[PDB]
Amino acid sequence: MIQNFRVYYRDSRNPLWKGPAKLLWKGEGAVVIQDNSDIKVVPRRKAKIIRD
Amino acid sequence: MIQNFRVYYRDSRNPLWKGPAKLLWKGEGAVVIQDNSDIKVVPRRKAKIIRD
């Protein structure tokens, strides 16, 4: 369903949103995305997916 | 491709393998699995997926 969607995520002690990570997984209330070489997971509530 | 595969994962300071978490994502060298209610990610090298 997805290919290249720019996902942005917030931070605990950081209000601003994080760069457009690479979409890897999107199911439950958490989303898995890669910022560069490492894969991170952030709650869907604190994340925002977008289309390139 | 997957439905209900029992995934086991090792730990840093723990040699033994962790319970059969729920399979959520499996792509790069990391695998996303849920132990109960929270979702965790462990390197494929330190993980082992299995069929129920």
Label each residue of chain B as H, E or C.
CCCCEEEEECCCCCCCCEEEEEEEEECCCEEEEECCCCEEEEEHHHEEEEEC
- B41, with CB counted inside 10 A (0-12, 13-18, 19+), is buried
Name the strand (E) or helix (H) holding A1: none
Q: Which of B7, B25, B36 to mutate to test the interface with A (most CBs of A within 10 A)?
A: B25
3-class SS of residue A50? strand
Architecture of domain B1-52: Roll (2.30)
Neighbour count for residue A45 (Cβ, 10 Å): 10
The amino acid sitting at B41 is V
**CA angle, corner A44, sides to A27 and A18, nearest 5?**
125
Q: Which of B2, B7, B39, B42 to mutate to test the interface with A (most CBs of A within 10 A)?
A: B39
List the beta bridge partners of residue A41.
A32
What residues contact B22, with CB distance under 8 A and at least 6 apart?
A: B4, B7, B33, B34, B35
| First-last CA distance in chain B | 14
C-alpha–C-alpha distance, residues A36 and B2, integer Å: 27
Instruction: Please report, for residues A5, A6, A7, B44, the alpha-carbon distance to residue A17 in angstroms, rounded to integers and kept in the order given.
Output: 15, 12, 10, 29
In this structure, the strands spanning B30-34 and B39-43 are antiparallel
- With beta carbons under 8 A apart, name residues in chain B contacting A25: 24-25, 27, 32
Neighbour count for residue B51 (Cβ, 10 Å): 9
Query: Which has the closest alpha carbon to B47: B38, B29, B4, A28?
Result: B29
